[PDB]
Design a protein around this ligand. Structure first.
Ligand code: NA
Length: 121
């Protein structure tokens, strides 16, 4: 149906916009702290602590399968990246502090993406 096609074109355009968001967020992480999964071969106890690991590469795979149906879904995964880091790492560490900073700088990017998704429909 043409209705189905139109929904598919909307999902594609949302995907395009979330790609630009994901690239922008990732530029706020030049050290690449959040780029890849934590390796269970080097924080071997990680999964006893953190139930839903998340990272930018994992988000990118989901994005490329058009796996985010709305901005809220994409935001939830970004929030897992930050929140997991702030739980596993202590307040005094480079990792916790990098998560605070990414959250702060990511706020700006996400605030405008919400306006664009609402405005474009
Ligand atoms: Na903690």
């Amino acid at each position: 149906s043409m209705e189905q096609v139109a929904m598919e074109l909307r999902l594609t355009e949302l995907t395009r916009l979330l790609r630009s968001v994901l690239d922008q967020l990732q530029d706020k992480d030049p050290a690449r702290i959040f780029a890849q999964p934590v390796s269970l071969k080097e924080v071997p106890d990680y999964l006893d602590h953190i139930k839903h690991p998340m990272d930018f590469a994992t988000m990118r795979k989901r994005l490329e399968a058009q796996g985010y149906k709305n901005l809220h879904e994409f935001e939830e995964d970004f929030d897992l990246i930050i929140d997991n880091c702030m739980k596993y790492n202590a307040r005094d560490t480079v990792f916790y502090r990098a998560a605070v900073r990414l959250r702060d700088q990511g706020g700006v990017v996400l605030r405008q993406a919400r306006r664009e998704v609402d405005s474009i429909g």
